[PDB]
Symmetry: D2
Subunit: 115 residues, 4 copies
């Protein structure tokens, strides 16, 4: 995949499974245009988001839906999404893995960019 | 102080000093409206951004300018900003501290919400 | 302070309050010798750990006791401490703040090293 | 795999490749006994460290060697290792994945424990 998203639940120490993910790309008119979406697999991973051809250069936002992921803990999180914005592919082709370690009031995210 | 932003340089182990922070609030037309702005201090801290009265419930985005901040490292970062989005207030006065520990291809952020 | 420790609860979005912290310094014979201890304040901070004089150069370990901090959540964490090791003071004096963002199965820590 | 380690370079946005990892187990005399070793792959991963039979309950330390790893960067890190300690395997086998996002003065680590 040119783009993969991996989400871990840092509270329970498990992949975050069946979590909805929306990807957007910044359009000419400065709006976020929907790009790809899905739900995480059993390994916390969302593969098959885009194709080489479709994954053009631009600014991308990854939105991971957390609103009620935390419901069973009794905690309302800091925001309904965990969001990460990255600027893509200005030097040839790159594949991107956006990895996110999520808690209700904190998250760590790393973009791994390979060629 | 309803809203404080603290930015740390995780590569150099130092406050991120004199770094521009823009705060926005999600507006009626779904765009981000400029809400408050400042530059981090020698302690990497940004105080006096807003007032209890201006800081109503809503969805806020903290945008930390990182474009050229690691020029001197010779690394172009994952994106020209570090962005943290949080949903505010609900009940009545809540004080927010958004702490970000920044690296070019990563970040960790925690929202500390008190009384 | 030559050394300060700040601990945040990443699950509840709070300072982690009244949490025990042990600091060790690696001894000549390659054991951790107790250095300082205490519990975090209402701001998640532990001040007055050491002095200028006592904070000699060396390898230090900070243990933050987390075992039952999580109890009320119904979660047993990855380890009974969150631990950070750092190498201290290799030129002139430096002040160190160790900041830790903790969850049961994850943490992020940053050492902020400034010269006074 | 009972124990897998994955290391990401948060400064360059890559896997941490060819990095030495030493695993220890807390021994009877309270010292750290050498338990397993390897070097991370091209994908920042370290597999085949131990077997289900050797990996009994106990306290384990994962030591990632970072001393000269950002020297090209011109940065001496907070410590010559990144260390993660976890308490293992109350019950029967669990698979552990220790994921570590490393910067010179900072790191984020998550233990993913699965059945
Ligand atoms: Zn894939
Ligand atoms: Zn800005
Ligand atoms: Zn203030
Ligand atoms: Zn941006
Ligand atoms: Zn102090
Ligand atoms: Zn080692
Ligand atoms: Zn494996
Ligand atoms: Zn070490």
């Amino acid at each position: 995949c040119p783009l993969m998203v991996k989400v871990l639940d840092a509270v329970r120490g498990s992949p975050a499974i069946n979590v909805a993910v929306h990807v957007f790309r910044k359009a000419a008119d400065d709006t976020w245009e929907p790009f790809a979406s899905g739900k995480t697999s059993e390994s916390g991973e969302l593969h098959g988001l885009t194709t080489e051809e479709e994954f053009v250069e631009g600014i991308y936002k990854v939105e991971i839906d957390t609103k009620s992921y935390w419901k069973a803990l009794g905690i309302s999180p800091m925001h309904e999404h965990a969001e990460v914005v990255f600027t893509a592919n200005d030097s040839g082709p790159r594949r991107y893995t956006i990895a996110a370690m999520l808690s209700p009031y904190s998250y760590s995210t790393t973009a791994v960019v390979t060629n």
